[PDB]
Design a protein around this nucleic acid. Structure first.
Length: 297
RNA sequence: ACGAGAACGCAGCACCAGCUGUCCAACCUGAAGAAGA
């Protein structure tokens, strides 16, 4: 609908559990954490939480885009309707991201397996050997896993009904970086809200199977409804609370397990914004609302 | 309230030691002060 295209001017660290490795995309909870930190910066975190918790600003995570080819993580189809031909094997296993316009072609079969992966080339992971210099003690060598994008390549975020407050927050997020070592020379980007036309048709479509496009956790009421004929995958969303005004020390947060952003469901559920920091003096939130892409097998 | 925050790939270290721009080789060859002053 409103593809937010992020163009990075420096390698990024989007780490999953440790500093030595980086991954190529950031999730929607990472982006909501960044925007909430910005909103606390300019004093309107309450309105941002109200907007996001009232579904007025719901977004997917960051997917790759290459030369105006919007990519999506390989949807978790049950592949019950492809054993007749093609390769129902590890051929469709190294394939990580498929284009979002060619999903119905992929879903019905006929998309090349080998061709896509070499076609899908956006930069490469990098080592960044660093140290903590000590005058008389020994220096502390550490490395930061980073990732540099190509020239005409970056990440894109699906947002429904962009908001003036969200536009104000994304301007502030340009100059504070996104990702791991952003205060070091890594997090840096410029964005374009970039309304799009061939994409809004995919989300105005209909179909039996729904593709989850944001790492989401169902409410306790609809977990049973969503966990029926579903092909999902959990992932722990924890780590350390990034704030200088929380718990007067460096404390971890309650690990949250959410459905991955490639899972497929027959029942649409609306996730929740989860309180994962309670013992501290501000609400640490895990954005886990649901963003879907309905298809028909 | 971004698997986070904080963290110099940094410190010491002579592009240096030995080595004739030397050896051989002729500034050499060929050539009248006459003639009617």
């Amino acid at each position: 609908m409103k593809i937010i295209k992020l163009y990075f001017e420096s390698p990024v660290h989007f780490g999953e559990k440790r500093l030595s490795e980086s991954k190529i995309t950031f999730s929607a909870d990472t982006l909501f954490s960044a925007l909430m930190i910005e909103a606390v910066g300019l004093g309107k975190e309450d309105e941002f939480y109200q907007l996001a918790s009232n579904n007025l600003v719901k977004f997917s995570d960051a997917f790759p885009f290459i030369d105006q080819y919007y990519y999506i993580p390989k949807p978790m189809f049950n592949l019950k309707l492809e054993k007749e031909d093609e390769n129902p094997s590890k051929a469709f296993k190294k394939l990580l991201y498929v284009p979002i316009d060619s999903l119905e072609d992929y879903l019905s079969g006929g998309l090349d397996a080998y061709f896509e992966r070499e076609s899908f080339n956006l930069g490469k992971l990098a080592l960044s050997e660093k140290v903590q210099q000590h005058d008389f003690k020994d220096s502390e060598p550490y490395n930061v896993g980073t990732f540099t994008f190509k020239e005409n390549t970056g990440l894109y975020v699906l947002i429904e009904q962009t908001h003036p407050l969200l536009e104000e927050l994304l301007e502030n997020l340009q100059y504070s970086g996104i990702g791991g070592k952003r205060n070091s020379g890594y997090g840096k980007f410029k964005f374009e809200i970039l309304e799009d036309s061939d994409i809004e048709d995919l989300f105005s479509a209909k179909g039996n199977r729904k593709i989850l496009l944001s790492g989401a956790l169902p409410k306790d009421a609809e977990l049973e409804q969503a966990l029926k004929n579903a092909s999902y995958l959990l992932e722990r969303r924890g780590g350390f609370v990034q704030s200088d005004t929380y718990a007067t020390n460096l404390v971890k947060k309650q690990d949250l397990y959410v459905f991955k952003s490639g899972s497929t469901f027959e029942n649409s559920f609306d996730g929740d914004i989860y309180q994962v920091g309670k013992k501290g003096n501000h609400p640490v939130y895990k954005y886990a609302k649901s963003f879907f892409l309905e298809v028909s097998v």
